[PDB]
Design a protein around this ligand. Structure first.
Ligand SMILES: Nc1nc2c(ncn2[C@@H]2O[C@H](COP(=O)(O)OP(=O)(O)OP(O)(O)=S)[C@@H](O)[C@H]2O)c(=O)[nH]1
Ligand SMILES: [Mg+2]
Length: 158
């Protein structure tokens, strides 16, 4: 009675992968978590979905159905590292069409070193959606995860 979607959250250290996941799971913002798998049942477009979410630093990398590729909008390096995460995902999947969303987190912070245009340009080159989030305020969090689910459906029957 529920459709399972296996999601994997990747990106450089400190960008907010756990905070985003915890927002989705607990509806709470964690300032300090310890640098595993989570399950969430949610109805997306009339379908009861069981999300299976791996918050990374492989099994889930080979078996993940879709990826959130997260950088922080005040961490230029994390943005630059997206290329390396995306290449990695493509290698395993032997495909240039893997369900993925580009997420620019920490939108509440004033210190923005990656502009929205840089991010939009990158997502456009990859053929994927770009969503801005804050795990702190919860702006964009559901959007990012729901959009990923929709991208998985777009690529394959579920
Ligand atoms: N202001 C603000 N801080 C955030 C946001 N998301 C995460 N943080 C903070 O950034 C720090 C890193 O977040 P965290 O979720 O631990 O990163 P991560 O990508 O999971 O890091 P890793 O080391 O486990 S591989 C934490 O102190 C967390 O509170 C956000 O949207 N806004
Ligand atoms: Mg973490």
């Amino acid at each position: 009675h529920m459709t399972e979607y296996k999601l994997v959250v990747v990106g450089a250290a400190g960008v907010g992968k756990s905070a985003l996941t915890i927002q989705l799971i607990q509806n709470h913002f964690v300032d300090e978590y310890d640098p595993d798998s989570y399950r969430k049942q949610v109805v997306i477009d009339g379908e009861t979905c069981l999300l299976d979410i791996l918050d990374t630093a492989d099994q889930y990398m080979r078996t993940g159905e879709g990826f959130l590729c997260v950088f922080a909008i005040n961490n230029t390096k994390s943005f630059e590292d997206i290329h390396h995460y995306r290449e990695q995902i493509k290698r395993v999947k032997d495909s240039e069409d893997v369900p993925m969303v580009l997420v620019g987190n920490k939108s509440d912070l004033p210190s923005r070193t990656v502009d929205t245009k840089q991010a939009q340009d990158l997502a456009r080159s990859y053929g994927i959606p770009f969503i801005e989030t804050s795990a702190k305020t919860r702006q964009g969090v559901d959007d990012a995860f729901y959009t990923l689910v929709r991208e998985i459906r777009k690529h394959k029957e579920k």
